Swiss-Prot record, chains A, B:
This is Viral protein genome-linked nsp9. Forms a primer, NSP9-pU, which is utilized by the polymerase for the initiation of RNA chains. Interacts with ribosome signal recognition particle RNA (SRP). Together with NSP8, suppress protein integration into the cell membrane, thereby disrupting host immune defenses. Homodimer. The lineage of its organism: Viruses, Riboviria, Orthornavirae, Pisuviricota, Pisoniviricetes. The chain holds residues 3864 to 3962 of 6781 of the full protein. It comes from the Viruses. It is found in: Host cytoplasm, Host perinuclear region; Host cytoplasm; Host endoplasmic reticulum. Residues 1-96 form the Nsp9 ssRNA-binding domain.
Length: 96, 96
């Protein structure tokens, strides 16, 4: 549950937008957990190894910047196990 | 996703000891998620009316400090759902 974040950019059929990729490597080898962006409607992140990484429909949430609360969008990678889903949320609402 | 904590005290068939409880209130009804001591072998935490919280056999883990590094023990309340389990670990490795 000790987790790392990266700026990467993403694609919607639309559409493109920057964001926050939270991910983890093991041992050893690397795999991304969730994506957090300013904008809805994204479908994919491009990730050795170039990877096609597909997101779930985002789950929206409020967050507090000193320029008004902005709304952020949270995209889990497909078929993430509930456990790591949890881990995400855990970390998320933990950045305060 | 959002957790809050509290110093509380715990019992075991052996004896007694102290630590930090990770909990999150249902609104406004308060829910205990897991317990982090410094000692193994604890089985219960009494609880907004008092209550019996059964602990799971603790999961050892490692953390730094001014006295060196430290063996910590983390006890999940019995029958937690996997989603909340993950949230804990998320919070856990977040707090740094």
């Amino acid at each position: 549950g000790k987790l790392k974040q990266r700026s990467i950019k993403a694609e919607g059929d639309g559409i493109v937008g920057e964001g926050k990729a939270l991910y983890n490597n093991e041992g050893g080898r690397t795999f991304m957990y969730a994506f957090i962006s300013d904008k809805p409607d994204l479908r994919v992140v491009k990730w050795g190894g170039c990877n096609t990484i597909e997101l779930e429909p985002p789950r929206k949430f409020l967050v507090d910047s000193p320029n008004g609360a902005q709304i952020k969008y949270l995209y889990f990678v497909r078929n993430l196990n509930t456990l790591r889903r949890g881990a995400v949320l855990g970390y998320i609402g933990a950045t305060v």
